């Protein structure tokens, strides 16, 4: 999904609000902040209602201005609540009644997702690969800066996982794929407009093809 959450390479932001080893305070800066992750785990591991991938995608589905003005942990309150309503576990009415006021949710999905690709390649360390030049309106774990770009395999995982573009929509056809650490030269991603060296992106097999 080419949403505002795909922030890598966006220009115009100011300084990162940190200097090294500065005090970051407590883990939680408010008494409610442990709730989104704890209730997500209730949903994933105790109820089986949704996957972690579905949590990432429901946050991506916040209305874009809403996303940009909402602090991190609040985005996951909104995302987990949204999934509980969409799965039929909770109603928005009851959430607003308990909350004492409005509880706007993420927007409905506009994609049914897609299955794990049937045709893929097992790549080896050192091989050159291109990121498939594809546009996916639902969940995908490919940041747009690497779409269509060429890099080299530095690692193939020894484990496999469900394809995000399927399991992030709760589909039954996510299969399993390994992922690949793909090293890109900074100039391949941003031309002359970068001060870095290389970027390594961890890309599912189904996002890749042999280069040239």
């Amino acid at each position: 999904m080419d949403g505002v959450h795909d922030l890598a390479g966006v220009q115009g932001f100011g300084k990162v609000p940190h200097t090294v080893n500065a005090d970051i305070g407590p883990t939680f800066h408010a008494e409610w902040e442990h709730l989104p992750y704890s209730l997500m785990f209730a949903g994933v591991a105790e109820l089986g209602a949704f996957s972690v991938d579905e949590v990432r995608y429901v946050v991506e589905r916040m209305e874009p201005r809403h996303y940009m003005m909402t602090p991190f942990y609040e985005r996951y309150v909104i995302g987990v609540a949204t999934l509980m309503v969409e799965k039929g576990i909770l109603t928005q009415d009851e959430l607003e009644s308990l909350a004492g006021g409005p509880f706007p949710l993420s927007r409905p999905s506009e994609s049914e997702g897609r299955p794990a690709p049937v045709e893929t390649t097992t790549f080896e360390v050192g091989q050159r690969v291109r990121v498939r030049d594809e546009y996916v309106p639902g969940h995908i774990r490919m940041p747009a800066y690497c779409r269509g770009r060429v890099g080299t395999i530095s690692h193939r995982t020894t484990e496999k996982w469900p394809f995000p573009d399927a399991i992030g929509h709760g589909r039954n056809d996510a299969g399993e794929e390994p992922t690949y650490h793909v090293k890109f030269a900074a100039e391949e991603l941003f031309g002359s407009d970068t001060d870095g060296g290389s970027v390594v992106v961890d890309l599912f097999e189904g996002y890749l093809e042999p280069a040239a």
Partner: protein
């Protein structure tokens, strides 16, 4: 008009979500309190620091940590949620590694701790992939010309930690002494371990 939607206070919304689920019997007794304790007291960068100090003083372990980070971390019993497939990446005299999750906030929770606000910020997510040298400099870490910066974007299930270079002036230190100068920021890759003067 680009205005924010009306919303009840976030505390009220978060506790409403808890109560709605709890009131339906869907949240076991003690469940969210147990997770808060795990997040606050068990997931910690002191664990990644212990792994770094061990790698610095034990060549055999260093080699395992760099080739099979999951196995190395499991010897310490530090695998966990958001930390099940671990890769450690080695800094060298010509290479500085830095970690981000540009799409959200993914972090090796059990050995780095939960990410701090700045790592989840839009500023870090947008900028460190494209101008990591400038970002690190602004944060207080100068990385010279002679060193490649390599940014790892945490986009799938690999969860990373940086194995920083061991600084001069620490020869012979105990693992406890070494652990002390390996901070959360050193594990993320934005800081270099510092030796007091």
């Amino acid at each position: 008009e680009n205005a924010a939607p009306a919303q009840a206070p976030v505390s009220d919304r978060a506790w409403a979500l808890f109560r709605a689920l709890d009131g339906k019997g869907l949240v076991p007794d003690g469940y969210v309190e147990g997770w808060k304790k795990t997040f606050e007291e068990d997931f910690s960068p002191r664990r990644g620091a212990e792994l770094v100090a061990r790698a610095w003083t034990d060549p055999e372990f260093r080699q395992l940590l760099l080739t099979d980070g999951t196995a190395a971390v499991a010897q310490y019993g530090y695998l966990g949620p958001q930390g099940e497939y671990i890769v450690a990446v080695e800094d060298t005299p010509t290479l500085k590694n830095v970690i981000v999750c540009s799409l959200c906030s993914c972090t090796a929770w059990p050995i780095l701790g939960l990410p701090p606000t700045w790592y989840k910020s839009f500023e870090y997510r947008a900028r460190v992939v494209r101008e990591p040298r400038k970002v690190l400099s602004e944060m207080g870490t100068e990385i010279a010309s002679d060193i490649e910066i390599r940014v790892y974007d945490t986009t799938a299930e690999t969860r990373y930690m940086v194995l920083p270079q061991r600084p001069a002036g620490t020869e012979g230190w105990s693992q406890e002494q070494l652990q002390e100068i390996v901070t959360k920021d050193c594990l993320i890759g934005v800081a270099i371990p510092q030796v007091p003067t």
